[PDB]
Amino acid sequence: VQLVESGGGLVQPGGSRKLSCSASGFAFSSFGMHWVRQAPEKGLEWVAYISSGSGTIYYADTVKGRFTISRDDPKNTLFLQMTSLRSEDTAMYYCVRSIYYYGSSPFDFWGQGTTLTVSSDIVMTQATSSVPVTPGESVSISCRSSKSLLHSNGNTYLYWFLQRPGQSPQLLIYRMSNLASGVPERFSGSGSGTAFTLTISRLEAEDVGVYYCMQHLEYPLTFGAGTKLEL
Amino acid sequence: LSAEDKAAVERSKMIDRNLREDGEKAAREVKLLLLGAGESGKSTIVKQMKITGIVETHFTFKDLHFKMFDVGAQRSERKKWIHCFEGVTAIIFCVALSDYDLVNRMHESMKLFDSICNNKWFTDTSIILFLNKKDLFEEKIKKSPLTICYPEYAGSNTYEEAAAYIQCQFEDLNKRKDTKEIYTHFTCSTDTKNVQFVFDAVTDVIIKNNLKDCGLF
Amino acid sequence: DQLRQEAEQLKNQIRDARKACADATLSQITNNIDPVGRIQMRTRRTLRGHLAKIYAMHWGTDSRLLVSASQDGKLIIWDSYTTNKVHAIPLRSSWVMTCAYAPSGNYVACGGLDNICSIYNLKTREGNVRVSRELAGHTGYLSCCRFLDDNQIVTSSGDTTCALWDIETGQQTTTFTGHTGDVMSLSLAPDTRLFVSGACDASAKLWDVREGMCRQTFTGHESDINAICFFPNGNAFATGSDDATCRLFDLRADQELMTYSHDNIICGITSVSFSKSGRLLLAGYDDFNCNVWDALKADRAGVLAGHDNRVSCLGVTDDGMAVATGSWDSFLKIWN
Amino acid sequence: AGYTVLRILPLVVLGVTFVLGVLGNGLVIWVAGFRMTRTVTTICYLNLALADFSFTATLPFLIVSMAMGEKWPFGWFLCKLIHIVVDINLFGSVFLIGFIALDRCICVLHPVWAQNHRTVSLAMKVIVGPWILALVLTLPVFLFLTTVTIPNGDTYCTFNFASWGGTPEERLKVAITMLTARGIIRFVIGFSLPMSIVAICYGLIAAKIHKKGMIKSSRPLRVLTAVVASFFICWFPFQLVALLGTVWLKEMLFYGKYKIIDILVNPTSSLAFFNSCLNPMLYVFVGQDFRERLIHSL
Amino acid sequence: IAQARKLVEQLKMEANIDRIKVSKAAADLMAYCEAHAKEDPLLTPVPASENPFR
Ligand SMILES: CC(C)c1c(NC(=O)Nc2ccc(Cl)cc2)c(=O)n(-c2ccccc2)n1C
């Protein structure tokens, strides 16, 4: 599975750019696709989404109307058409796949991203922003939800992402309880509708990075400020 | 309420549209069940139609897609899997005319025909009977008599009369003459006229089925 | 015929040995228990995706996801709670007579008239369901396939033989010979070390998965056995046949315990399952109505007449919450 | 006088039409729409049943009107609703009968084409073409039809062109032109297009099955001649009485020369509503597949 | 003819079973049924707030 973004560059404020997401190695037509941008030295923000089949499209309130998201399933690419660009749209845009069925792991794969350099909501708050830890300790990252994420169906829609320095985020825990494929069992998740916890047991050198929460209960999908672990 | 169960439903409705589009594509192809006891011309005729377990064969003729299923390499109880072919448009049954004297072997073809023709799964299913190897039958019938297969056969040992006798002995094995028709053909190395005969029989079956769906029949 | 005679001698010895053990029938022992007769279940869900006859359905171990096999060439995994379709697998051969869902949930198996047990990987790095490996050592149609693990599946066939397979290699590690008719059904033991098989010789055989040989043979029936299911304890099993009779056999006693037959029923049994406690016997019928039986008293405690066509498969969830019945009318219903 | 039974039998047949049409159309709507697999034939039968079930449902407000000398007791909404349903449903019954004839003819004359291109989705897409054409043909009832009060105290539902004309001669000129329109469309779209299509299509599938020798009983000819004649016997007397009244439209109004036509409008119309009673019996009840679902799900 | 030699061998193996009397074998099936009768949802209509199906 590879998601490669392209179309990034410096743009004058007010111009227009189209982002491309060359997706190879997976069934693109069966995956809902997301664009999640990261303002420089800042946190993740969800901007757009297309369902599998293109039937359902949602946009962030910040970019709604002036941002257009489209996909070409035969060409296996995702497009983000950007118009009326402003100075706060400068970010690394990540292309994210998400498949929605019972037992699925949405947001499992994130693309590399491309940088633009243009010259109510379920607020998710991470209590801390930096956490000094040693390679043997067991950190328990915290998360807070403005609205309870527990649903009538019994699912708590909290996802945990880890973004290592100079890399794209990787899903660790989806639905706050079960860990994603390819993740060591050291990571664990817990919570009761609000006040969620990500517990790591044997923090290796590869666990160092910024940890982001995200709610999938309601659009727009809001991320946390991000908790960082320094070694 | 639905949070991302709203997107599972969209997937459940996107893979329910493909089921309809695959069912429309699968219900536009004529399904034929190819039968025949022991050595017969079924392997030979399958070559004529321009294509272990079920040997599914696809051929198109006159814009009509066909799907033929050979169950020859299936030694088991037919009663346990014959109901799988209940909705076939027609059954193609192959009988080797040159098996009247062999081993007896022609009577086994009659047992298989009687078992399927009067089967409760095929009461309206028409049968396209192929009396294969008509060239070997005429060559053999001069020396060997049809008496060796039918003791009670009051007739001459010529091809055009004994062949009609065989067609009668196979076309009178059905007890459902009101609800289904048997199309009989004689084939040895017919130059692509077997596909024409199957197309005509299938077209008649499709028309009769369209009448039964309406009230005309 | 010199040694054919001693076969009758050993048959008489076994018949006498199991006759002596039959001191008191199960019907006499259950003349004091409280009967259940108000078993009325209603169709909670109707799964409508299939466009042809449904031949096999299998519940997941989570009691929520079920796999359904039909002759439109589709294997559909359903979310029984929401009626949603999780996956729709296009089979290479549409003549599938069986389907299994892996206990882990990572695979489904599908077999039929193609003589191949196809293993499908449900959880892949891609989003599609891919054929894991086709098991092609059988000679007749596959009638039943049951997963022992992610790497072991036992399949019954019309070649009269049951086989145990190693999925990652693809070779039948153990073959189970001994039947004389087409094997139509399989039922794994709850411990997955034994399995019973029902074939067209009107006999059920208990097999040792590890050893590979049959330890017991049950021949109460008169016609071919179409369904077989273990009692939840694992020490008994029930068989359904075209004889229109369901029997109960106890492995330890090694003979028939109870017979579940009624005069109003002339049609044969296509599927047999037990309730979670084993008190109810859910049997599918060709009269278009499933029949709930008091497994201890042999009384019809209920009828599931929601199908306009022959019931072909039925299964009860591991939770015991619901019974799902598939039918030739192309519809699969969940009864609670 | 002798012209007294003519005020009775139209009332008797429409009540019989109302009861029998409601029961038959409901049975077919339930069995075909809910207890049968959706097929192109089933969709056509359900659509035809919907037209003549709703038309029979709106029949009793035309029974009471006819019983009270064509006076309309109900409100202005119902006169501009019960006559919209009758014109849409009656023109939709004739165009669905034509569509069923065309489908039955295509399934027999080109069975290979009807095998590769005749789907449920295409049937649903095309089955609304008759429904849109029925809607377009009722606009003269949407715009020009209303209740009119007479100083005697009686309100009659009729085509009033007072607002459209604005001048006594100009109102008459638009009235004659628009009435001649929905009279001539009534024959050419209501009878000459469906009856010709039915006669040609059923005549073609009677020659085809005869040329190919598929008559093994008298049931095919009986059902085909019934579906052909029953449409003619019921629809033709009314459409002729109406076409005569539209060709001689001015003579009926200014001079009243032909009062026989006006008194024949009520029996002939009742006979043409009885076709809605016969439609479920002739098209869907004849099928053994449908009957084996009514008794198997009774 | 190996069919007889194998069939007699299988019958001999099936004869050597420590069979249990039906009375203990039947009373051990009703023992399991009552020991799990409470946890059988199909046996009795459970409250609609504990039934996953509407
Ligand atoms: C049924 C009642 C309301 C009615 C008319 N309304 C229609 O007849 N509508 C219609 C729609 C489609 C088709 Cl095919 C045939 C007829 C109509 O003109 N009447 C009439 C009035 C004066 C003279 C002759 C007839 N009368 C009495």
Author numbering:
A (entry chain E): 2 to 120, 136 to 247
B (entry chain A): 5 to 55, 182 to 233, 241 to 354
C (entry chain B): 5 to 340
D (entry chain R): 20 to 317
E (entry chain C): 9 to 62
Wording from the paper:
The formylpeptide receptors (FPRs) mediate pattern recognition of formylated peptides derived from invading pathogens or mitochondria from dead host cells. With few exceptions, all of them primarily signal through G proteins of the heterotrimeric Gi/o family. We report cryo-EM structures of Gi-coupled FPR1 and FPR2 bound to a formylpeptide and Gi-coupled FPR2 bound to two synthetic peptide and small-molecule agonists. Structural analysis also suggests that diverse FPR agonists sample a conserved activation chamber at the bottom of ligand-binding pockets to activate FPRs.
C43 is a potent small-molecule agonist of both FPR1 and FPR235. The relatively high-resolution map of FPR2-C43 allows us to unambiguously define the binding pose of C43. As a non-peptide synthetic FPR2 agonist, C43 sits at the bottom region of the ligand-binding pocket. At the mouth region of the chamber, the two carbonyl groups of C43 in the urea and pyrazolone moieties, respectively, engage in multiple hydrogen bonds with R2015.38 and R2055.42 of FPR2, while the urea amine group forms a salt bridge with D1063.33 of FPR2. In addition, the methylethyl group attached to the pyrazolone group of C43 forms hydrophobic interactions with L812.62, H1023.29, V2847.35, and F2927.43 of FPR2. Individual mutations of R2015.38 and R2055.42 at the mouth region or F1103.37 in the activation chamber could lead to nearly undetectable agonistic action of C43, suggesting important roles of these residues in the binding of C43. Structural comparison of FPR2 bound to C43 and peptide agonists indicates that the chlorophenyl group of C43 attached to the urea moiety overlaps with the terminal methionine residues in three peptide agonists, which implies a conserved receptor activation mechanism for both peptide and non-peptide FPR2 agonists. Similar to peptide agonists, C43 causes conformational changes of residues in the activation chamber including V1133.40 and W2546.48 through direct interactions to activate the receptor. Collectively, these results suggest that for C43 and its derivatives, the chemical groups occupying the activation chamber of FPR2 need to be of sufficient size or length in order to induce conformational changes of critical residues in the chamber to activate the receptor. On the other hand, for the small-molecule FPR2 agonist C43, our structure only revealed one orthosteric site overlapping with the binding site of formylpeptides.
